[PDB]
Amino acid sequence: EDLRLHLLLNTSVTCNDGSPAGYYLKESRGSRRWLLFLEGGWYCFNRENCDSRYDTMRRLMSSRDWPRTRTGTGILSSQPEENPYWWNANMVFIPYCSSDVWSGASSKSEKNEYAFMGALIIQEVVRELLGRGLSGAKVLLLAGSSAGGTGVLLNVDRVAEQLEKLGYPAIQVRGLADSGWFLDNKQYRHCAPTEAIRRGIRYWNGVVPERCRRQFQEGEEWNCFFGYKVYPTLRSPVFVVQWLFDEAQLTVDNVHPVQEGLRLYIQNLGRELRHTLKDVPASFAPACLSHEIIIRSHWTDVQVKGTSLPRALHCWDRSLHTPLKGCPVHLVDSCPWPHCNPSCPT
Ligand SMILES: *[C@@H]1O[C@H](CO)[C@@H](O)[C@H](O)[C@H]1NC(C)=O
Numbered sequence: 170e171d172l173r174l175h176l177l178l179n180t181s182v183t184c185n186d187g188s189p190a191g192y193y194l195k196e197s198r199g200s201r202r203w204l205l206f207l208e209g210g211w212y213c214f215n216r217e218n219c220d221s222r223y224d225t226m227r228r229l230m231s232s233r234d235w236p237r238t239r240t241g242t243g244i245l246s247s248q249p250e251e252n253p254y255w256w257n258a259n260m261v262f263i264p265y266c267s268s269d270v271w272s273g274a275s276s277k278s279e280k281n282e283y284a285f286m287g288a289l290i291i292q293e294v295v296r297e298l299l300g301r302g303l304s305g306a307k308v309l310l311l312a313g314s315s316a317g318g319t320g321v322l323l324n325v326d327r328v329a330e331q332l333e334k335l336g337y338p339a340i341q342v343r344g345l346a347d348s349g350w351f352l353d354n355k356q357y358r359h360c361a362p363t364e365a366i367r368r369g370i371r372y373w374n375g376v377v378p379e380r381c382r383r384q385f386q387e388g389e390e391w392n393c394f395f396g397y398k399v400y401p402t403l404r405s406p407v408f409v410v411q412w413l414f415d416e417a418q419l420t421v422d423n424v425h426p427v428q429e430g431l432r433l434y435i436q437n438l439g440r441e442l443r444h445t446l447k448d449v450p451a452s453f454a455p456a457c458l459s460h461e462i463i464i465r466s467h468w469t470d471v472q473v474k475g476t477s478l479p480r481a482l483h484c485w486d487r488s489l490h491t492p493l494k495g496c497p498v499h500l501v502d503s504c505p506w507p508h509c510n511p512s513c514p515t
């Protein structure tokens with residue numbers, strides 16, 4: 170089940186500390202499908218808080234200690250029983266070592282203690298994979314969880330543009346954003362989350378998709394980190410997986426028996442998330458308190474309206490060949506409290 174580490178041949182494309190970035194790959198020679206998964210794990214946004222992350226979360230800032238292999242799990246598993254959706258695909262795990270929500274385009278230098286190269290890491294992984302078989306692909310699914318899910322939204326159209334400009338117009342680029350669809354909502358108690366993104370973008374030289382940038386304009390690029398604002402600007406097909414009560418959303422909202430004020434807050438959050446997905450035709454949004462799903466081994470277990478996530482993704486593939494009989498692609502729970510769906514993870 171193992172994916173093998175390859176450090177980037179272009180060693181100018183680096184993790185935060187200047188060590189080379191890389192990717193883990195398991196090829197499937199009989200397949201023209203490629204799954205490129207972006208790991209998540211928050212971010213850091215100034216010298217002091219990146220230094221702390223370097224002390225105790227160093228694998229998210231450096232390749233120096235990465236293992237030579239990783240086991241593929243969930244959507245990265247090659248076992249049909251664990252991955253009914255894409256078990257025969259070529260599998261790529263791209264470690265998150267740039268701490269920039271995959272948006273950065275800044276090298277380490279005499280003025281920069283850290284490199285923030287997430288956007289460039291994605292493009293360099295794609296370039297190097299073209300020499301390893303990606304050139305023959307029919308579908309490239311850029312997937313990701315948490316900050317990696319936001320990274321999908323920020324980067325899927327740039328991957329599509331890169332392959333067009335390199336002369337590969339037959340590769341269909343698509344996105345799968347898991348747990349990366351956040352609300353810039355009012356907190357339950359008062360930390361300034363949107364301010365941290367704004368500061369981060371300046372620290373990272375962060376880049377956002379061009380059409381979204383042109384809408385919000387200079388200084389307001391932080392808006393494009395919020396799915397409901399950036400998604401309408403995207404041209405590539407994007408399937409959105411989002412728990413209605415995402416634990417990271419609750420964290421940025423300062424939410425941890427439940428009285429009326431908090432009950433109303435939680436119910437309003439789920440309703441707002443539901444509302445932002447009403448016109449997202451490929452989506453899976455269960456009424457659960459959880460965080461991430463697609464690379465979890467039991468990702469097969471959750472269902473919305475009787476349809477599992479692997480089935481919904483399979484129906485999405487069919488829709489991209491009018492709605493499909495018994496094969497839905499838009500699956501959003503309507504019940505208003507975490508675990509009102511009996512299939513929620515424990
Ligand atoms: C290596 O990466 C750097 C930084 O992204 C880029 O500017 C440069 O063109 C790359 N070199 C090659 C040979 O691909």
Ligand SMILES: CN1C(=O)CC[C@H]1c1cccnc1
Nearest residue numbers: 211315316351362363417421
């Ligand atoms: C990008 N994000 C994560 O990786 C988890 C939480 C989310 C976020 C939203 C708003 C402000 N800061 C962070």
